[PDB]
Amino acid sequence: MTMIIGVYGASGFGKEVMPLVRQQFPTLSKEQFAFIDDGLSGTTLNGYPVLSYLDFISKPADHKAVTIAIANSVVREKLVSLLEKDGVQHLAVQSTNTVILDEVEIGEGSLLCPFTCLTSNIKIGKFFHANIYSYVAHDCVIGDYVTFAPGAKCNGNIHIEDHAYIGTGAVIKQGTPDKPLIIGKGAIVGMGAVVTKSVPAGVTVVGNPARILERK
Amino acid sequence: MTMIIGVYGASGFGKEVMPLVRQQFPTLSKEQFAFIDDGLSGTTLNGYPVLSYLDFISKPADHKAVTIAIANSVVREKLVSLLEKDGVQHLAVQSTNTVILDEVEIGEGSLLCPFTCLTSNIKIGKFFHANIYSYVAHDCVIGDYVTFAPGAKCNGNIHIEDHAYIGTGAVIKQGTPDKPLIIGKGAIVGMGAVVTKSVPAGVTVVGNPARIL
Amino acid sequence: MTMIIGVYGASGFGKEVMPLVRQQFPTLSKEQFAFIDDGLSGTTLNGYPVLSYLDFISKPADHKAVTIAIANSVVREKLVSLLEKDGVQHLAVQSTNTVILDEVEIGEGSLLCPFTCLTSNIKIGKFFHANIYSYVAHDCVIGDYVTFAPGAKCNGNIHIEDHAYIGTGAVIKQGTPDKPLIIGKGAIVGMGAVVTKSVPAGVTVVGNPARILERK
């Protein structure tokens, strides 16, 4: 009851995030960890209890911290507001084999999975998720609530705006110091996409080369 | 003499697997290792004897273990029954930098090369080969004799059936808990393919988006 | 005094390479390192001096050594010729997590970034550059001034001749011991390309499957 740690999201990447958090805090006992999930509430998962947000907040504990495993960026932002209302701490999570080089600034709530790499001179906003094998290269600027799926490749001089999603195995061409390649606010780079130029806000791009997807 | 280790396949991935098996068993002396290859039999490779299978089986050793470094799924299954006939052990081989998270069940004869990753809640059958940079994500089920080429990306809630082959740099969309994405028995996902829906048994798909070849 | 190390190239991969070379030679103090860049001569970068080539060469120091961060292989070759005139020593730089297996022969001036992998029975020429997540598999022969962009995947039995550039996220199909797949001298494999057959010297390919795009 000195500290309880929650992984918000029992389904999906939550099961991947839990062991990473266990490794971040190896001296905490298993009983100090829980999944938070309104829906899978009441159950157990991989030996951990699954709590509703109310049961989690109501637990007796001097300090509480949470990592939000939820991929959807809008939901992530919503859960964050909730956590802050209740004064819960945002946990930063990284993997043992993550590589980070020079002058990398990272906002709170980061989550960096195995085999991730951030090189040099990079600014990343809040609640950035980088799934396995994804990377950010030199002179990039990443906004808030950005999500990289596994194997997402963000090369040099790219600016990615808030709420963007870079899909599995996608690759993004480097920009230049004078002309960064921009991934627009809320833009979605679909899996396997090969992005050769800036992506407008709010569109989905797919294919090689990447093109705007007609969705209806 | 107490233990001899064989790497089945001297051409191809065999040369990559031997250093992995050497590191996996550091206290064994060089002389306890060999390639097994009918054909290159009698020769030498990176300082190791290359023996015929018969020659290998006949060596005086209390215990014998083999890793099959052959990517071809059908040959692999053939060599397995051969080994079992002679009571040779199936060696499991991982790389020093391989990552495995929670609740991963793996059948005998697995081979996980450098930079491989298995996440959480995964069931993998027998004689699974994952080459460099390949991964399996959450809640997947992988059958027997499945093979991942380098960089193959298997995302969450995917079921990959026996003898499937996932080509280099290929990427598979995640399923969901109610509807897994399924890679059918003996299906071939071609290199660089971008798979967005289930692949029927015995079929080859290629391209982005992946389409039947 | 005694030894100074230059990183040739302040822009592009320079800021990535500097911390790698720092780690390669951890007993050398920061003051013994500089970026070499005529354009940015006189400035400072990530707390390091940026020197013109002439000023670097003019330093009082028994021994001078350089790693060329520049990916552009044509420029890289001219720079080497420049460095040889002044008898500057060429450094080899790897990353801590780089993996190299059996019988890998590598010429001087190699640069292997984080998460790179060289397997077995490989011959690599001079001034090879492998950026993050790139690899070379078994039985490959790689010439001089070859550049692998990040995530470049060179499978088995491939011969990549002088000055070839393998683009970010590109994949090259394995050849056979009898029929190696050949990437011709000075060819350019475009980002994201899926190369299924030999590429002629001096041309560019792109796409899935890769097709010749620029041949004149």
Side-chain angles (χ1 to χ4, degrees), chain B residues 12-13 15-16 19 23 46 97 114-115 132-133 150 168 191-192 207-208, chain C residues 97 102-103 115-117 120-121 135 138-139 155 171 173 195-196 208:
Chain B
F13 292 131
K15 303 170 216 200
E16 165 201 34
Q23 293 178 34
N46 300 154
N97 70 5
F115 302 101
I132 55 179
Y133 304 94
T168 315
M191 70 160 165
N208 178 4
Chain C
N97 69 5
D102 274 350
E103 301 291 342
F115 302 101
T116 41
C117 183
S120 302
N121 292 272
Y135 70 73
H138 68 88
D139 298 300
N155 298 109
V171 195
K173 187 183 180 167
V195 185
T196 62
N208 180 0

PDB file of all heavy atoms in Angstrom, chain B residues 12-13 15-16 19 23 46 97 114-115 132-133 150 168 191-192 207-208, chain C residues 97 102-103 115-117 120-121 135 138-139 155 171 173 195-196 208:
ATOM      1  N   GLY B  12      23.406 -22.474 -46.639  1.00  0.00           N
ATOM      2  CA  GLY B  12      22.334 -21.602 -46.199  1.00  0.00           C
ATOM      3  C   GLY B  12      22.428 -21.206 -44.739  1.00  0.00           C
ATOM      4  O   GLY B  12      23.491 -20.788 -44.270  1.00  0.00           O
ATOM      5  N   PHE B  13      21.315 -21.351 -44.022  1.00  0.00           N
ATOM      6  CA  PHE B  13      21.206 -20.844 -42.656  1.00  0.00           C
ATOM      7  C   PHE B  13      22.066 -21.609 -41.663  1.00  0.00           C
ATOM      8  O   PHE B  13      22.308 -21.137 -40.558  1.00  0.00           O
ATOM      9  CB  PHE B  13      19.741 -20.784 -42.213  1.00  0.00           C
ATOM     10  CG  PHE B  13      18.940 -19.751 -42.963  1.00  0.00           C
ATOM     11  CD1 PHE B  13      17.710 -20.070 -43.527  1.00  0.00           C
ATOM     12  CD2 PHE B  13      19.446 -18.462 -43.141  1.00  0.00           C
ATOM     13  CE1 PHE B  13      16.982 -19.122 -44.239  1.00  0.00           C
ATOM     14  CE2 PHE B  13      18.727 -17.502 -43.844  1.00  0.00           C
ATOM     15  CZ  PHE B  13      17.491 -17.834 -44.406  1.00  0.00           C
ATOM     16  N   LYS B  15      25.199 -21.887 -41.551  1.00  0.00           N
ATOM     17  CA  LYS B  15      26.386 -21.134 -41.152  1.00  0.00           C
ATOM     18  C   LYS B  15      26.038 -20.064 -40.118  1.00  0.00           C
ATOM     19  O   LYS B  15      26.896 -19.615 -39.348  1.00  0.00           O
ATOM     20  CB  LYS B  15      27.069 -20.483 -42.360  1.00  0.00           C
ATOM     21  CG  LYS B  15      27.479 -21.440 -43.477  1.00  0.00           C
ATOM     22  CD  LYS B  15      27.913 -20.655 -44.731  1.00  0.00           C
ATOM     23  CE  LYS B  15      27.495 -21.347 -46.012  1.00  0.00           C
ATOM     24  NZ  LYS B  15      28.303 -20.853 -47.170  1.00  0.00           N
ATOM     25  N   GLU B  16      24.779 -19.642 -40.130  1.00  0.00           N
ATOM     26  CA  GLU B  16      24.276 -18.654 -39.178  1.00  0.00           C
ATOM     27  C   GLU B  16      23.923 -19.334 -37.849  1.00  0.00           C
ATOM     28  O   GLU B  16      24.164 -18.799 -36.764  1.00  0.00           O
ATOM     29  CB  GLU B  16      23.029 -17.980 -39.765  1.00  0.00           C
ATOM     30  CG  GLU B  16      22.203 -17.197 -38.753  1.00  0.00           C
ATOM     31  CD  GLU B  16      20.759 -16.979 -39.207  1.00  0.00           C
ATOM     32  OE1 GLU B  16      20.191 -17.869 -39.888  1.00  0.00           O
ATOM     33  OE2 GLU B  16      20.191 -15.912 -38.876  1.00  0.00           O
ATOM     34  N   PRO B  19      27.096 -20.576 -34.983  1.00  0.00           N
ATOM     35  CA  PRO B  19      27.577 -19.653 -33.949  1.00  0.00           C
ATOM     36  C   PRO B  19      26.550 -19.469 -32.838  1.00  0.00           C
ATOM     37  O   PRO B  19      26.931 -19.229 -31.699  1.00  0.00           O
ATOM     38  CB  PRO B  19      27.744 -18.328 -34.698  1.00  0.00           C
ATOM     39  CG  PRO B  19      27.764 -18.679 -36.135  1.00  0.00           C
ATOM     40  CD  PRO B  19      27.041 -19.955 -36.318  1.00  0.00           C
ATOM     41  N   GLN B  23      27.216 -20.461 -28.818  1.00  0.00           N
ATOM     42  CA  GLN B  23      27.068 -19.506 -27.714  1.00  0.00           C
ATOM     43  C   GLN B  23      26.085 -20.030 -26.687  1.00  0.00           C
ATOM     44  O   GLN B  23      26.167 -19.705 -25.498  1.00  0.00           O
ATOM     45  CB  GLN B  23      26.580 -18.146 -28.227  1.00  0.00           C
ATOM     46  CG  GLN B  23      27.590 -17.426 -29.084  1.00  0.00           C
ATOM     47  CD  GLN B  23      27.063 -16.101 -29.621  1.00  0.00           C
ATOM     48  OE1 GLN B  23      26.284 -15.409 -28.954  1.00  0.00           O
ATOM     49  NE2 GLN B  23      27.490 -15.743 -30.834  1.00  0.00           N
ATOM     50  N   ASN B  46      33.809 -23.573 -42.090  1.00  0.00           N
ATOM     51  CA  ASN B  46      34.158 -22.664 -41.002  1.00  0.00           C
ATOM     52  C   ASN B  46      34.838 -23.395 -39.839  1.00  0.00           C
ATOM     53  O   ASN B  46      34.634 -23.065 -38.671  1.00  0.00           O
ATOM     54  CB  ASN B  46      32.936 -21.871 -40.521  1.00  0.00           C
ATOM     55  CG  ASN B  46      32.318 -21.008 -41.627  1.00  0.00           C
ATOM     56  OD1 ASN B  46      31.127 -20.690 -41.588  1.00  0.00           O
ATOM     57  ND2 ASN B  46      33.125 -20.641 -42.618  1.00  0.00           N
ATOM     58  N   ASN B  97      20.197 -11.941 -27.688  1.00  0.00           N
ATOM     59  CA  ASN B  97      19.367 -10.734 -27.654  1.00  0.00           C
ATOM     60  C   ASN B  97      17.874 -10.958 -27.940  1.00  0.00           C
ATOM     61  O   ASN B  97      17.102  -9.999 -28.036  1.00  0.00           O
ATOM     62  CB  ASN B  97      19.941  -9.658 -28.583  1.00  0.00           C
ATOM     63  CG  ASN B  97      19.788 -10.021 -30.060  1.00  0.00           C
ATOM     64  OD1 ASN B  97      19.173 -11.039 -30.400  1.00  0.00           O
ATOM     65  ND2 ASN B  97      20.343  -9.189 -30.940  1.00  0.00           N
ATOM     66  N   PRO B 114      18.954 -13.803 -34.103  1.00  0.00           N
ATOM     67  CA  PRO B 114      19.125 -12.480 -33.497  1.00  0.00           C
ATOM     68  C   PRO B 114      18.001 -11.473 -33.791  1.00  0.00           C
ATOM     69  O   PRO B 114      17.361 -11.500 -34.854  1.00  0.00           O
ATOM     70  CB  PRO B 114      20.461 -12.013 -34.083  1.00  0.00           C
ATOM     71  CG  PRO B 114      21.223 -13.299 -34.250  1.00  0.00           C
ATOM     72  CD  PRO B 114      20.171 -14.229 -34.817  1.00  0.00           C
ATOM     73  N   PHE B 115      17.754 -10.611 -32.807  1.00  0.00           N
ATOM     74  CA  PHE B 115      16.742  -9.564 -32.885  1.00  0.00           C
ATOM     75  C   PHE B 115      15.312 -10.076 -33.056  1.00  0.00           C
ATOM     76  O   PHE B 115      14.459  -9.365 -33.565  1.00  0.00           O
ATOM     77  CB  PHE B 115      17.107  -8.525 -33.958  1.00  0.00           C
ATOM     78  CG  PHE B 115      18.441  -7.864 -33.717  1.00  0.00           C
ATOM     79  CD1 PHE B 115      19.572  -8.265 -34.417  1.00  0.00           C
ATOM     80  CD2 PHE B 115      18.567  -6.854 -32.786  1.00  0.00           C
ATOM     81  CE1 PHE B 115      20.804  -7.666 -34.190  1.00  0.00           C
ATOM     82  CE2 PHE B 115      19.812  -6.239 -32.548  1.00  0.00           C
ATOM     83  CZ  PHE B 115      20.924  -6.647 -33.248  1.00  0.00           C
ATOM     84  N   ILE B 132      16.146 -13.586 -38.357  1.00  0.00           N
ATOM     85  CA  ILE B 132      16.477 -12.291 -37.768  1.00  0.00           C
ATOM     86  C   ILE B 132      15.401 -11.214 -37.934  1.00  0.00           C
ATOM     87  O   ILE B 132      14.782 -11.091 -38.991  1.00  0.00           O
ATOM     88  CB  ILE B 132      17.850 -11.777 -38.237  1.00  0.00           C
ATOM     89  CG1 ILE B 132      17.920 -11.720 -39.762  1.00  0.00           C
ATOM     90  CG2 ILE B 132      18.953 -12.693 -37.707  1.00  0.00           C
ATOM     91  CD1 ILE B 132      19.252 -11.190 -40.249  1.00  0.00           C
ATOM     92  N   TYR B 133      15.172 -10.469 -36.856  1.00  0.00           N
ATOM     93  CA  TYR B 133      14.173  -9.397 -36.799  1.00  0.00           C
ATOM     94  C   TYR B 133      12.707  -9.815 -36.898  1.00  0.00           C
ATOM     95  O   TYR B 133      11.839  -8.950 -36.922  1.00  0.00           O
ATOM     96  CB  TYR B 133      14.456  -8.318 -37.856  1.00  0.00           C
ATOM     97  CG  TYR B 133      15.841  -7.741 -37.751  1.00  0.00           C
ATOM     98  CD1 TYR B 133      16.880  -8.263 -38.506  1.00  0.00           C
ATOM     99  CD2 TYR B 133      16.111  -6.681 -36.892  1.00  0.00           C
ATOM    100  CE1 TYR B 133      18.146  -7.752 -38.420  1.00  0.00           C
ATOM    101  CE2 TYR B 133      17.394  -6.144 -36.796  1.00  0.00           C
ATOM    102  CZ  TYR B 133      18.403  -6.685 -37.566  1.00  0.00           C
ATOM    103  OH  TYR B 133      19.673  -6.174 -37.499  1.00  0.00           O
ATOM    104  N   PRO B 150      13.491 -13.516 -42.488  1.00  0.00           N
ATOM    105  CA  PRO B 150      13.899 -12.313 -41.748  1.00  0.00           C
ATOM    106  C   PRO B 150      12.905 -11.161 -41.881  1.00  0.00           C
ATOM    107  O   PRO B 150      12.378 -10.926 -42.972  1.00  0.00           O
ATOM    108  CB  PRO B 150      15.244 -11.948 -42.376  1.00  0.00           C
ATOM    109  CG  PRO B 150      15.765 -13.250 -42.899  1.00  0.00           C
ATOM    110  CD  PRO B 150      14.550 -13.997 -43.389  1.00  0.00           C
ATOM    111  N   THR B 168      10.264 -12.708 -46.276  1.00  0.00           N
ATOM    112  CA  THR B 168      11.078 -11.616 -45.748  1.00  0.00           C
ATOM    113  C   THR B 168      10.352 -10.285 -45.778  1.00  0.00           C
ATOM    114  O   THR B 168       9.778  -9.908 -46.791  1.00  0.00           O
ATOM    115  CB  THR B 168      12.368 -11.459 -46.554  1.00  0.00           C
ATOM    116  OG1 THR B 168      12.937 -12.747 -46.766  1.00  0.00           O
ATOM    117  CG2 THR B 168      13.348 -10.623 -45.806  1.00  0.00           C
ATOM    118  N   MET B 191       7.594 -12.479 -49.901  1.00  0.00           N
ATOM    119  CA  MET B 191       8.380 -11.411 -49.306  1.00  0.00           C
ATOM    120  C   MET B 191       7.778 -10.042 -49.595  1.00  0.00           C
ATOM    121  O   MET B 191       7.236  -9.782 -50.680  1.00  0.00           O
ATOM    122  CB  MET B 191       9.839 -11.473 -49.752  1.00  0.00           C
ATOM    123  CG  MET B 191      10.066 -11.122 -51.192  1.00  0.00           C
ATOM    124  SD  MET B 191      11.791 -10.651 -51.452  1.00  0.00           S
ATOM    125  CE  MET B 191      11.810 -10.755 -53.224  1.00  0.00           C
ATOM    126  N   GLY B 192       7.838  -9.172 -48.598  1.00  0.00           N
ATOM    127  CA  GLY B 192       7.339  -7.817 -48.763  1.00  0.00           C
ATOM    128  C   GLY B 192       5.828  -7.753 -48.853  1.00  0.00           C
ATOM    129  O   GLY B 192       5.282  -6.685 -49.064  1.00  0.00           O
ATOM    130  N   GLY B 207       2.532  -8.896 -52.744  1.00  0.00           N
ATOM    131  CA  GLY B 207       2.202  -7.513 -53.020  1.00  0.00           C
ATOM    132  C   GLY B 207       1.583  -6.739 -51.878  1.00  0.00           C
ATOM    133  O   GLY B 207       1.326  -7.269 -50.794  1.00  0.00           O
ATOM    134  N   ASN B 208       1.344  -5.463 -52.147  1.00  0.00           N
ATOM    135  CA  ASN B 208       0.735  -4.540 -51.210  1.00  0.00           C
ATOM    136  C   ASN B 208      -0.395  -3.797 -51.922  1.00  0.00           C
ATOM    137  O   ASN B 208      -0.136  -2.917 -52.738  1.00  0.00           O
ATOM    138  CB  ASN B 208       1.799  -3.550 -50.739  1.00  0.00           C
ATOM    139  CG  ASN B 208       1.258  -2.512 -49.791  1.00  0.00           C
ATOM    140  OD1 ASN B 208       0.088  -2.551 -49.412  1.00  0.00           O
ATOM    141  ND2 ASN B 208       2.116  -1.577 -49.388  1.00  0.00           N
TER     142      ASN B 208
ATOM    143  N   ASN C  97      24.873  -2.833 -29.405  1.00  0.00           N
ATOM    144  CA  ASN C  97      24.009  -3.976 -29.665  1.00  0.00           C
ATOM    145  C   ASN C  97      24.185  -4.609 -31.051  1.00  0.00           C
ATOM    146  O   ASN C  97      23.407  -5.486 -31.432  1.00  0.00           O
ATOM    147  CB  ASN C  97      22.532  -3.638 -29.407  1.00  0.00           C
ATOM    148  CG  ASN C  97      21.965  -2.657 -30.427  1.00  0.00           C
ATOM    149  OD1 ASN C  97      22.639  -2.281 -31.387  1.00  0.00           O
ATOM    150  ND2 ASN C  97      20.725  -2.233 -30.213  1.00  0.00           N
ATOM    151  N   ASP C 102      29.859 -15.478 -37.777  1.00  0.00           N
ATOM    152  CA  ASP C 102      31.089 -16.171 -38.193  1.00  0.00           C
ATOM    153  C   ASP C 102      31.661 -15.706 -39.532  1.00  0.00           C
ATOM    154  O   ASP C 102      30.920 -15.466 -40.470  1.00  0.00           O
ATOM    155  CB  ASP C 102      30.835 -17.675 -38.315  1.00  0.00           C
ATOM    156  CG  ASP C 102      31.004 -18.415 -36.997  1.00  0.00           C
ATOM    157  OD1 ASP C 102      31.494 -17.809 -36.016  1.00  0.00           O
ATOM    158  OD2 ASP C 102      30.645 -19.615 -36.959  1.00  0.00           O
ATOM    159  N   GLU C 103      32.984 -15.627 -39.619  1.00  0.00           N
ATOM    160  CA  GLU C 103      33.651 -15.453 -40.908  1.00  0.00           C
ATOM    161  C   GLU C 103      33.139 -14.219 -41.650  1.00  0.00           C
ATOM    162  O   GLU C 103      32.829 -14.279 -42.842  1.00  0.00           O
ATOM    163  CB  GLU C 103      33.462 -16.698 -41.783  1.00  0.00           C
ATOM    164  CG  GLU C 103      34.005 -17.993 -41.174  1.00  0.00           C
ATOM    165  CD  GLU C 103      35.527 -18.028 -41.097  1.00  0.00           C
ATOM    166  OE1 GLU C 103      36.190 -17.236 -41.805  1.00  0.00           O
ATOM    167  OE2 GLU C 103      36.059 -18.856 -40.324  1.00  0.00           O
ATOM    168  N   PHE C 115      21.213  -1.784 -33.672  1.00  0.00           N
ATOM    169  CA  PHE C 115      20.352  -2.860 -34.170  1.00  0.00           C
ATOM    170  C   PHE C 115      20.754  -3.389 -35.538  1.00  0.00           C
ATOM    171  O   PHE C 115      19.916  -3.898 -36.291  1.00  0.00           O
ATOM    172  CB  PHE C 115      18.867  -2.451 -34.165  1.00  0.00           C
ATOM    173  CG  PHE C 115      18.368  -2.059 -32.813  1.00  0.00           C
ATOM    174  CD1 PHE C 115      18.230  -0.722 -32.472  1.00  0.00           C
ATOM    175  CD2 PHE C 115      18.075  -3.030 -31.861  1.00  0.00           C
ATOM    176  CE1 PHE C 115      17.789  -0.360 -31.212  1.00  0.00           C
ATOM    177  CE2 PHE C 115      17.634  -2.673 -30.590  1.00  0.00           C
ATOM    178  CZ  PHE C 115      17.485  -1.336 -30.268  1.00  0.00           C
ATOM    179  N   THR C 116      22.032  -3.283 -35.867  1.00  0.00           N
ATOM    180  CA  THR C 116      22.508  -3.884 -37.106  1.00  0.00           C
ATOM    181  C   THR C 116      22.977  -5.308 -36.870  1.00  0.00           C
ATOM    182  O   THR C 116      23.332  -5.685 -35.753  1.00  0.00           O
ATOM    183  CB  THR C 116      23.661  -3.102 -37.738  1.00  0.00           C
ATOM    184  OG1 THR C 116      24.570  -2.674 -36.713  1.00  0.00           O
ATOM    185  CG2 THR C 116      23.121  -1.894 -38.518  1.00  0.00           C
ATOM    186  N   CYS C 117      23.007  -6.087 -37.941  1.00  0.00           N
ATOM    187  CA  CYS C 117      23.336  -7.493 -37.842  1.00  0.00           C
ATOM    188  C   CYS C 117      24.037  -7.955 -39.104  1.00  0.00           C
ATOM    189  O   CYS C 117      23.539  -7.741 -40.207  1.00  0.00           O
ATOM    190  CB  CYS C 117      22.060  -8.310 -37.633  1.00  0.00           C
ATOM    191  SG  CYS C 117      22.348 -10.111 -37.396  1.00  0.00           S
ATOM    192  N   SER C 120      26.912 -14.689 -41.266  1.00  0.00           N
ATOM    193  CA  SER C 120      28.125 -15.492 -41.455  1.00  0.00           C
ATOM    194  C   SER C 120      28.614 -15.608 -42.902  1.00  0.00           C
ATOM    195  O   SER C 120      27.815 -15.673 -43.832  1.00  0.00           O
ATOM    196  CB  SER C 120      27.913 -16.910 -40.902  1.00  0.00           C
ATOM    197  OG  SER C 120      27.562 -16.864 -39.534  1.00  0.00           O
ATOM    198  N   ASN C 121      29.933 -15.673 -43.069  1.00  0.00           N
ATOM    199  CA  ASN C 121      30.535 -15.916 -44.375  1.00  0.00           C
ATOM    200  C   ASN C 121      30.197 -14.775 -45.315  1.00  0.00           C
ATOM    201  O   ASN C 121      29.505 -14.958 -46.314  1.00  0.00           O
ATOM    202  CB  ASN C 121      30.060 -17.250 -44.949  1.00  0.00           C
ATOM    203  CG  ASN C 121      30.584 -18.432 -44.157  1.00  0.00           C
ATOM    204  OD1 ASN C 121      31.668 -18.944 -44.426  1.00  0.00           O
ATOM    205  ND2 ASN C 121      29.839 -18.835 -43.147  1.00  0.00           N
ATOM    206  N   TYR C 135      20.696  -5.093 -42.132  1.00  0.00           N
ATOM    207  CA  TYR C 135      21.460  -6.321 -41.949  1.00  0.00           C
ATOM    208  C   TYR C 135      21.996  -6.885 -43.252  1.00  0.00           C
ATOM    209  O   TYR C 135      21.512  -6.556 -44.332  1.00  0.00           O
ATOM    210  CB  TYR C 135      20.618  -7.379 -41.237  1.00  0.00           C
ATOM    211  CG  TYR C 135      19.483  -7.955 -42.052  1.00  0.00           C
ATOM    212  CD1 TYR C 135      19.728  -8.835 -43.104  1.00  0.00           C
ATOM    213  CD2 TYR C 135      18.163  -7.665 -41.737  1.00  0.00           C
ATOM    214  CE1 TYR C 135      18.679  -9.393 -43.844  1.00  0.00           C
ATOM    215  CE2 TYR C 135      17.114  -8.215 -42.467  1.00  0.00           C
ATOM    216  CZ  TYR C 135      17.381  -9.076 -43.519  1.00  0.00           C
ATOM    217  OH  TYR C 135      16.339  -9.617 -44.239  1.00  0.00           O
ATOM    218  N   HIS C 138      23.785 -14.358 -44.936  1.00  0.00           N
ATOM    219  CA  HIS C 138      24.903 -15.265 -45.233  1.00  0.00           C
ATOM    220  C   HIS C 138      25.361 -15.243 -46.694  1.00  0.00           C
ATOM    221  O   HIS C 138      24.546 -15.113 -47.610  1.00  0.00           O
ATOM    222  CB  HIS C 138      24.534 -16.708 -44.851  1.00  0.00           C
ATOM    223  CG  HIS C 138      23.462 -17.295 -45.713  1.00  0.00           C
ATOM    224  ND1 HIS C 138      23.734 -17.944 -46.899  1.00  0.00           N
ATOM    225  CD2 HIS C 138      22.116 -17.301 -45.582  1.00  0.00           C
ATOM    226  CE1 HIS C 138      22.602 -18.338 -47.454  1.00  0.00           C
ATOM    227  NE2 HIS C 138      21.603 -17.954 -46.680  1.00  0.00           N
ATOM    228  N   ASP C 139      26.668 -15.381 -46.892  1.00  0.00           N
ATOM    229  CA  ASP C 139      27.248 -15.558 -48.220  1.00  0.00           C
ATOM    230  C   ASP C 139      27.079 -14.349 -49.134  1.00  0.00           C
ATOM    231  O   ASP C 139      26.976 -14.493 -50.344  1.00  0.00           O
ATOM    232  CB  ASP C 139      26.700 -16.833 -48.876  1.00  0.00           C
ATOM    233  CG  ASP C 139      27.064 -18.088 -48.082  1.00  0.00           C
ATOM    234  OD1 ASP C 139      28.271 -18.348 -47.900  1.00  0.00           O
ATOM    235  OD2 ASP C 139      26.147 -18.786 -47.601  1.00  0.00           O
ATOM    236  N   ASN C 155      19.342 -10.099 -47.843  1.00  0.00           N
ATOM    237  CA  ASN C 155      19.350 -11.521 -47.539  1.00  0.00           C
ATOM    238  C   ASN C 155      20.494 -12.293 -48.180  1.00  0.00           C
ATOM    239  O   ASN C 155      21.470 -11.702 -48.628  1.00  0.00           O
ATOM    240  CB  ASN C 155      17.994 -12.132 -47.863  1.00  0.00           C
ATOM    241  CG  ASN C 155      16.894 -11.517 -47.033  1.00  0.00           C
ATOM    242  OD1 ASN C 155      16.051 -10.760 -47.534  1.00  0.00           O
ATOM    243  ND2 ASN C 155      16.915 -11.807 -45.746  1.00  0.00           N
ATOM    244  N   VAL C 171      13.849  -4.347 -49.246  1.00  0.00           N
ATOM    245  CA  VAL C 171      14.152  -5.754 -49.042  1.00  0.00           C
ATOM    246  C   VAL C 171      14.693  -6.339 -50.327  1.00  0.00           C
ATOM    247  O   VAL C 171      14.148  -6.096 -51.406  1.00  0.00           O
ATOM    248  CB  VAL C 171      12.889  -6.550 -48.716  1.00  0.00           C
ATOM    249  CG1 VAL C 171      13.263  -7.929 -48.144  1.00  0.00           C
ATOM    250  CG2 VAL C 171      12.018  -5.769 -47.761  1.00  0.00           C
ATOM    251  N   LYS C 173      15.633  -9.936 -52.255  1.00  0.00           N
ATOM    252  CA  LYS C 173      15.471 -11.385 -52.300  1.00  0.00           C
ATOM    253  C   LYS C 173      16.795 -12.121 -52.319  1.00  0.00           C
ATOM    254  O   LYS C 173      17.759 -11.674 -52.941  1.00  0.00           O
ATOM    255  CB  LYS C 173      14.694 -11.779 -53.556  1.00  0.00           C
ATOM    256  CG  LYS C 173      14.331 -13.254 -53.613  1.00  0.00           C
ATOM    257  CD  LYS C 173      13.622 -13.603 -54.912  1.00  0.00           C
ATOM    258  CE  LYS C 173      13.267 -15.092 -54.937  1.00  0.00           C
ATOM    259  NZ  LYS C 173      12.299 -15.423 -56.036  1.00  0.00           N
ATOM    260  N   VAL C 195      12.954  -5.937 -53.944  1.00  0.00           N
ATOM    261  CA  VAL C 195      13.784  -6.328 -55.077  1.00  0.00           C
ATOM    262  C   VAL C 195      13.754  -7.837 -55.284  1.00  0.00           C
ATOM    263  O   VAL C 195      14.206  -8.585 -54.426  1.00  0.00           O
ATOM    264  CB  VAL C 195      15.235  -5.880 -54.872  1.00  0.00           C
ATOM    265  CG1 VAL C 195      16.075  -6.184 -56.100  1.00  0.00           C
ATOM    266  CG2 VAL C 195      15.282  -4.390 -54.552  1.00  0.00           C
ATOM    267  N   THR C 196      13.237  -8.268 -56.435  1.00  0.00           N
ATOM    268  CA  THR C 196      13.040  -9.688 -56.715  1.00  0.00           C
ATOM    269  C   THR C 196      14.025 -10.226 -57.745  1.00  0.00           C
ATOM    270  O   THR C 196      14.043 -11.410 -58.027  1.00  0.00           O
ATOM    271  CB  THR C 196      11.608  -9.966 -57.194  1.00  0.00           C
ATOM    272  OG1 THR C 196      11.372  -9.268 -58.423  1.00  0.00           O
ATOM    273  CG2 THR C 196      10.605  -9.483 -56.155  1.00  0.00           C
ATOM    274  N   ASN C 208       6.904  -2.419 -55.341  1.00  0.00           N
ATOM    275  CA  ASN C 208       6.677  -3.794 -54.922  1.00  0.00           C
ATOM    276  C   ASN C 208       5.786  -4.492 -55.974  1.00  0.00           C
ATOM    277  O   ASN C 208       4.569  -4.302 -55.991  1.00  0.00           O
ATOM    278  CB  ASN C 208       6.003  -3.783 -53.534  1.00  0.00           C
ATOM    279  CG  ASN C 208       5.723  -5.182 -52.986  1.00  0.00           C
ATOM    280  OD1 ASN C 208       6.027  -6.185 -53.623  1.00  0.00           O
ATOM    281  ND2 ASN C 208       5.150  -5.244 -51.779  1.00  0.00           N
TER     282      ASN C 208
END
